[PDB]
Amino acid sequence: SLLTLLWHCSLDALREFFSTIVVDAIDVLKTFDTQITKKMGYYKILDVMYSRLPNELTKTLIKLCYDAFTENLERRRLYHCA
Amino acid sequence: EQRFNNFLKALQEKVEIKQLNHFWEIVVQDGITLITKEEASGSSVTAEEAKKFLAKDKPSGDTAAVFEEGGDVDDLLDMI
Structure with a gap:
């Protein structure tokens, strides 16, 4: 569902919707x-x-994703790919 | 004389490559008296002038800080 809208959503509603859930994603990221x-x-x-x-x-978020790949059951590989 | 001249060169470059808070600045401002060669004049005075002012400043180079895995973090802090 989501990527369909996200790839084609208006680039203004994108900003609003994401800025609504910036920390809502940062917190759940950990x-x-x-x-x-x-x-x-x-x-x-x-x-x-x-x-x-x-x-x-x-600026912080970058690192918060980088380590997510650098870790070294197939769901783990899919996680690294994502 | 010349032996302590090359000794002066060695100690000056050694303190230069050394990084201190109360660094050779105190030494230099008191090293206004013969921190350089004096056995044959001409070269002695110009070398003294060159060594008195330690010669320039410009920063360059990426990922050169402590713990390079924070150097990218240092690079990470450049966007805001």
């Missing part, structure tokens, strides 16, 4: 299948978010 699935979705929505254009907290 059995276990639920966690990895939610983070799947979070990566797959934040990438499309960033695809548009560039507050000041955003």
Whole structure:
């Protein structure tokens, strides 16, 4: 569902909707299948978010995703890919 | 004389590459008296002038801080 709208949503409603849920995603960014699935979705929505254009907290978020890949069952590989 | 001249060169470059708070600045402002060669004049005086002012300043170079995995973080803090 989401990526369909996100790839084609108006670049103004995009800003409003995301700015509504910036911290709502930052906090949740940090059995276990639920966690990895939610983070799947979070990566797959934040990438499309960033695809548009560039507050000041955003600087941190970069690292918060980088380590997410650098860790070294297939859901783990999908997580690294996302 | 010349032995302590090359010794002066060595100690000056050694303190230069050393980084201190109360660094050679105190030494230099008191090193206004013969911090450089004096055995044959001409070269002695010009070398003294060159060494008195330690010669320029310009910063460059990426990922050169402590703990490079924070150097990218230092690079990370450049967008706001």
